[PDB]
Amino acid sequence: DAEFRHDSGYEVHHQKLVFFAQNVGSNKGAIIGLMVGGV
Amino acid sequence: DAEFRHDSGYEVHHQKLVFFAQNVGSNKGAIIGLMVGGV
Amino acid sequence: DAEFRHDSGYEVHHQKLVFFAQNVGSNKGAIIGLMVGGV
Amino acid sequence: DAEFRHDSGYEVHHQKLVFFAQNVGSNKGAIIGLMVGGV
Amino acid sequence: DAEFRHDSGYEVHHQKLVFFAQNVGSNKGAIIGLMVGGV
Questions:
Q1: Which of A19, A37, C28 is closest to B16 using CA atoms?
Q2: Are D31 and E35 in contact (CB under 8 A)?
Q3: Is D23 helix (H, G, I), strand (E, B) or coil?
Q4: Is the CB of C27 less than 8 angstroms away from the CB of A32?
Q5: Chain D from 3 to 32: CB within 8 A of any E CB
Q6: How far apart are CA E38 and CA D2, in angstroms?
Q7: In Å, how far are A27, B22, C28 from B29, measured between CA atoms?
Q8: Which DSSP string do the residues of B1-39 spell out, in sequence order?
Q9: How many Å lie between the alpha carbon of C26 and the closest alpha carbon of chain B?
C-alpha cells in the first residue's frame, strides 16, 4: 500500500473563538475528543 | 493499492466561532468526537 | 506500507480565543481530549 | 512500514488567548488533556 | 518501521495569553495535562 507518494497540501486559515480543538499531522491510531464514561 | 500518487490539495480558509474542532492530515485508524458512554 | 514518501504540507494560521488545544505532528497511538470517567 | 520518508511540513502561526495547550512533535504512545476520574 | 527519514518541519509562532502549556519535541510514552483523580 502506497499513499501520498508526492507533494500534498493541507492548512487551516484564520481560526478564532474556539473551545475545544485538536490538530494532528499524522495519526496512526485513535483520536478521542470529549469523553465522559470510563474506558 | 496506490493512492495520492502525485500532487494533491486540501485546505480550510477563514474559520471562526467554533466550539469543537478536529483537524487531521492522515488518520490510519479511528477518530472520535463527542463520546459519553464508556468504551 | 508506505506513506508520505515525499514532500507534504500542513499548517494552522492565526489562531485566537481558544480554551483547549492539542497540536501533534505525528501520533503513533492514542490521543485524549477531555476525559471525566476513570480509565 | 515507512512514513514521512522525505521532507514534510507543519506549523501553527500567531496563537493567542489560550487556556490549555499541548504541542508535540512526535508521540509514540498516548496523549491526555483534561482528566478528572482516576486511572 | 521507519518515520521522518529526512528533513521535517514544525513550529509555533507568536504565542500569548496562555494558562497551561506543554511543548514536547519527541514523546515515546504518555502525556498528561490537568489531572484531578489519583492514579
A1: A19
A2: no
A3: strand
A4: no
A5: 3-32
A6: 38
A7: 8, 15, 10
A8: -B---S-----B-S--S-SEEEEEEEESSEE--EE-S--
A9: 9
Q: How far apart are CA B31 and CA E15, in angstroms?
A: 28
Alpha-carbon dihedral E14, C23, E1, D6, rounded to 10 degrees: -40
**Residue D15 contacts residue A12 (beta carbons within 8 Å):** no
d(CA A21, CA A9): 20
C-alpha separations of B31 from A6, A21, B28, E23 in Å: 25, 14, 9, 23
Is B10 annotated in a binding site? The answer is yes
**Cα separation, A20 vs D20, whole angstroms:** 9
Give the resolution to one decimal, in Å.
4.2
Contact B25 C12 (CB under 8 A): no
Contacts with B5 from chain A: Cβ below 8 Å: 2, 5-6
Using alpha carbons only, how large is chain E's radius of gyration in Å? 15
Q: Say yes or no for a CB contact (<8 Å) between E10 and C25.
A: yes
Q: For the beta carbon of residue E39, count every other beta carbon within 10 angstroms.
A: 8
How far is the C-alpha of D3 from the C-alpha of C5, rounded, in Å? 7
Q: Which of B1, B23, B34, B35 to mutate to test the interface with A (most CBs of A within 10 A)?
A: B23
- What are the cell numbers at A36? 465522559
List the one residue out of D20, C32, D32, C36 whose CA is nearest residue E37: C36
